[PDB]
Design a protein around this ligand. Structure first.
Ligand SMILES: O=C(O)C(=O)CC(=O)c1ccccc1
Ligand SMILES: [Mn+2]
Ligand SMILES: [Mn+2]
Length: 204
């Protein structure tokens, strides 16, 4: 029995912390070689993690990164943020039930994460990437906010919601999380490697 579930009710509202621009500081860091291995189910990326220095950026990458067939088209997105979410996409209805007397499209939207805490707070997290610059990253983040703001606001009448975004570009991150330099660098480092592996997968 969990006592933190027995607290008075929090304010039921939508909270959005402001977006901030972060710059990567990956200053000439080893990037691991890779070989794309044919598998029964999708591919497995054989990545030479032994080439990396202990604790350098990229230390969250696994020696063998499985990419099942069903996750292939979102590889760039999912490899980039794979150290933060095992998987992505959870439907609103799975956490809130149907909002109104009748279901509608907002019940079946699925941001990359919907996290419910014992204290009764819900965190909605959306990841996105861009091949553009920091200005393109800020625009992609604002587009994800606009995509989910209505569903979050309506469901905030049930449990309070905080909506977080991470948008990655080649040289940094736009996010309303409060990220360290090392956390920014991990996201960017994985995105940069993901871009490389993608140029190969698309040719194959
Ligand atoms: O674009 C993103 O940032 C997504 O997180 C997309 C996503 O979930 C998805 C799922 C199924 C089909 C197309 C996109
Ligand atoms: Mn998604
Ligand atoms: Mn996403």
């Amino acid at each position: 029995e969990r006592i933190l579930k027995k607290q008075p009710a929090p304010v039921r509202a939508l909270t959005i912390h402001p977006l901030r621009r972060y710059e990567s500081s990956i200053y000439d860091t080893p990037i691991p070689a890779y070989v794309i291995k044919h598998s029964s189910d999708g591919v497995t990326i054989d990545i030479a993690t032994s080439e990396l220095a202990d604790g350098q950026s990229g230390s969250t990458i696994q020696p063998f990164e499985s990419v099942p067939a069903q996750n292939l088209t979102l590889f760039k997105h999912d490899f980039t943020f794979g150290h933060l979410a095992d998987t992505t996409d959870k439907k609103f209805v799975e956490v809130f039930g149907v909002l109104e007397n009748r279901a509608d499209d907002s019940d079946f939207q699925s941001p990359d994460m919907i996290i419910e805490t014992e204290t009764g707070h819900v965190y909605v997290v959306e990841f996105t990437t861009t091949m553009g610059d920091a200005n393109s990253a800020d625009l992609a983040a604002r587009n994800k906010i606009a995509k989910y703001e209505i569903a979050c606001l309506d469901r905030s009448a049930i449990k309070p919601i905080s909506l977080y975004i991470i948008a990655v570009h080649f040289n940094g991150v736009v996010s309303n999380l409060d990220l360290s330099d090392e956390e920014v660098n991990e996201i960017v480092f994985r995105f940069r490697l993901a871009r490389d592996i993608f140029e190969e997968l698309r040719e194959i």
